[PDB]
mmCIF file of C-alpha atoms in Angstrom:
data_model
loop_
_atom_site.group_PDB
_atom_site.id
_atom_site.type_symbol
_atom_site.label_atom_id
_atom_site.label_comp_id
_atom_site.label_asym_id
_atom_site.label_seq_id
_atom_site.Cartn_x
_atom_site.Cartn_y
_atom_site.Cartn_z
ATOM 1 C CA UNK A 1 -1.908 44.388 -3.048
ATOM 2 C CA UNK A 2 0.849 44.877 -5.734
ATOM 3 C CA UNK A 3 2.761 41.304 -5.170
ATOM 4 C CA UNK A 4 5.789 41.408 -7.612
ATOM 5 C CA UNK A 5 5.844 37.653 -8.360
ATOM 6 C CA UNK A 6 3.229 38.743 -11.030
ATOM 7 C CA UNK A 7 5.521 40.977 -13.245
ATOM 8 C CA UNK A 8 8.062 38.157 -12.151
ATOM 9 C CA UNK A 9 6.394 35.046 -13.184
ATOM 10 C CA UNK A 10 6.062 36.272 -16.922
ATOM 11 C CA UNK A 11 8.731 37.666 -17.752
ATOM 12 C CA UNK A 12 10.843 34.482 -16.290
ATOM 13 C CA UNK A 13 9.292 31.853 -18.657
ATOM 14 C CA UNK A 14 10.077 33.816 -21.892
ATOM 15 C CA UNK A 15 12.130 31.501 -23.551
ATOM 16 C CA UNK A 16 16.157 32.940 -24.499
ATOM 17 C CA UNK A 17 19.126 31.103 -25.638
ATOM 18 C CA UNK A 18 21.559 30.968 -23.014
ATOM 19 C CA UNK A 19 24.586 30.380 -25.676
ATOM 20 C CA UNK A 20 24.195 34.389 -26.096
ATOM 21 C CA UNK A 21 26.674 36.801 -23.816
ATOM 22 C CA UNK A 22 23.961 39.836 -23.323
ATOM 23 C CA UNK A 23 20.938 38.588 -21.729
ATOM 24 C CA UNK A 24 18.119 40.944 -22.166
ATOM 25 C CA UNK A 25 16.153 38.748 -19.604
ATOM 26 C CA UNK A 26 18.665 39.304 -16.955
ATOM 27 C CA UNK A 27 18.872 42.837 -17.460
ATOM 28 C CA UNK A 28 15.608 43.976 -16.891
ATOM 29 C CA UNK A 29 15.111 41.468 -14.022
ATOM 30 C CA UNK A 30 18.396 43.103 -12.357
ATOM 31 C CA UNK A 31 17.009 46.353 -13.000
ATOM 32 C CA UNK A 32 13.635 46.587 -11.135
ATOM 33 C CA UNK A 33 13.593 43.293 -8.921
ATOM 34 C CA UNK A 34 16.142 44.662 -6.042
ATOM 35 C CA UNK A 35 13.289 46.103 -3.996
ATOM 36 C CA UNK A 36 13.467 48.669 -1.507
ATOM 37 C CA UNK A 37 10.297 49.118 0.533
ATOM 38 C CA UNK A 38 7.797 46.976 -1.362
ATOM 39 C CA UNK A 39 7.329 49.777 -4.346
ATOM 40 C CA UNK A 40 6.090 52.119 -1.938
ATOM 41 C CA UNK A 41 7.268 54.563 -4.352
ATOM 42 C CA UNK A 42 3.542 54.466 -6.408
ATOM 43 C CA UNK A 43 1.889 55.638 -3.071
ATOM 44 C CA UNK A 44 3.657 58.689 -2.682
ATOM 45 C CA UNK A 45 2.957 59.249 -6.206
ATOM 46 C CA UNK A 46 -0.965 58.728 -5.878
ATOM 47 C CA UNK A 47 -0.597 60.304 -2.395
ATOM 48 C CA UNK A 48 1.119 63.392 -3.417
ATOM 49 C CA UNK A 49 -1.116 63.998 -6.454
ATOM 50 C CA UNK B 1 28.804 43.058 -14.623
ATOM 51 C CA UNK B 2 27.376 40.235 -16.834
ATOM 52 C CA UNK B 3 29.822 38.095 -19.314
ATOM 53 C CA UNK B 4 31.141 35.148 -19.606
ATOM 54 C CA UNK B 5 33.960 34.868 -17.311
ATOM 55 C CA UNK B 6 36.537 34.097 -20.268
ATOM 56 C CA UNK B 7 35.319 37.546 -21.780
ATOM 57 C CA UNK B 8 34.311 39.867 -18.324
ATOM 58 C CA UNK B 9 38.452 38.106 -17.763
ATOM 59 C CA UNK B 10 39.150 39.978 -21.146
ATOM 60 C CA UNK B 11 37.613 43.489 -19.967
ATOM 61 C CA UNK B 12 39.999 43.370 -16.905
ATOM 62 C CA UNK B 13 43.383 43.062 -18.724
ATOM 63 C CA UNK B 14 42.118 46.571 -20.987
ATOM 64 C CA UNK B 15 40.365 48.363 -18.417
ATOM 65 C CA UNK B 16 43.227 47.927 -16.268
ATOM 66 C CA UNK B 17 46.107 48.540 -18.398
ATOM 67 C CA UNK B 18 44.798 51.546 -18.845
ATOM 68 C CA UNK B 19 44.718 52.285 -15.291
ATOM 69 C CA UNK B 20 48.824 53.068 -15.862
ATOM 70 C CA UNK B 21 47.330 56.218 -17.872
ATOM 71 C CA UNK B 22 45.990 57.213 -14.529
ATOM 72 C CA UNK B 23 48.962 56.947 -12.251
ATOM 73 C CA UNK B 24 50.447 59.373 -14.876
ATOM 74 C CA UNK B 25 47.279 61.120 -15.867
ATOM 75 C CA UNK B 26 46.646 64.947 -16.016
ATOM 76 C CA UNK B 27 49.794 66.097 -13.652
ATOM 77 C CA UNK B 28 49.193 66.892 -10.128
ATOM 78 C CA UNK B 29 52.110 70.048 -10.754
ATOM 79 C CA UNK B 30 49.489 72.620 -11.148
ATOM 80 C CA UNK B 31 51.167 74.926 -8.836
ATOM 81 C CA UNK B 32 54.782 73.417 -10.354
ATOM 82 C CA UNK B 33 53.490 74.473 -13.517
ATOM 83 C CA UNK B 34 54.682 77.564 -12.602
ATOM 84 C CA UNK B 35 57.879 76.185 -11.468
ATOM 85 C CA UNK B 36 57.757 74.739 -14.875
ATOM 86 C CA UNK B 37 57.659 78.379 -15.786
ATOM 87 C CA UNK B 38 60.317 79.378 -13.201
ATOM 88 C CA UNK B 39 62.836 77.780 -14.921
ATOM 89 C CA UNK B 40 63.176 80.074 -18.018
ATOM 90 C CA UNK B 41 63.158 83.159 -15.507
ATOM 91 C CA UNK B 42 66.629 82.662 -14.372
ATOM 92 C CA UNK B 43 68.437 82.871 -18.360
ATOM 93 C CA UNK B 44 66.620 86.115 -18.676
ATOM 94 C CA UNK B 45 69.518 89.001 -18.759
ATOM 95 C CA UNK B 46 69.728 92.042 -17.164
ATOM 96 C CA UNK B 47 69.221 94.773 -19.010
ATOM 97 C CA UNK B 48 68.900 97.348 -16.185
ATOM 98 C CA UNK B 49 72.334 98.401 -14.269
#
């Protein structure tokens, strides 16, 4: 059961100043956390292999 | 789109006053290029009478 508030929960208590313009916390966190159907993307991968 | 608002507020005054390149970008007059060209026809003599 691949629950996303694992990836999530470490990556949010990494410790960043906020006084900095680029925030390479709230990049990567905009990059894979929009989710469109639950990472079903893996199955098709292990399905298709 | 991630900045502070006084500098993402910067990016807008130079991306858009360089939108004023665009309203007078690469000329539409593609076919009136030729018309461009059509207007050194007309001082052309004639040598055949």
């Amino acid at each position: 059961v691949l629950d996303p508030t694992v990836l999530t929960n470490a990556i949010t208590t990494i410790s960043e100043s906020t006084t900095q313009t680029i925030s390479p916390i709230s990049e990567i966190l905009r990059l894979l956390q929009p989710m469109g159907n639950d990472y079903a993307a893996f199955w098709k991968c292990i399905a298709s292999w | 789109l991630l900045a502070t608002p006084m500098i993402n507020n910067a990016i807008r005054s130079f991306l858009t006053a360089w939108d004023d390149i665009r309203i007078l970008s690469p000329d539409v007059s593609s076919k009136s290029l030729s018309a461009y060209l059509d207007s050194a026809v007309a001082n052309g003599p004639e040598l055949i009478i």
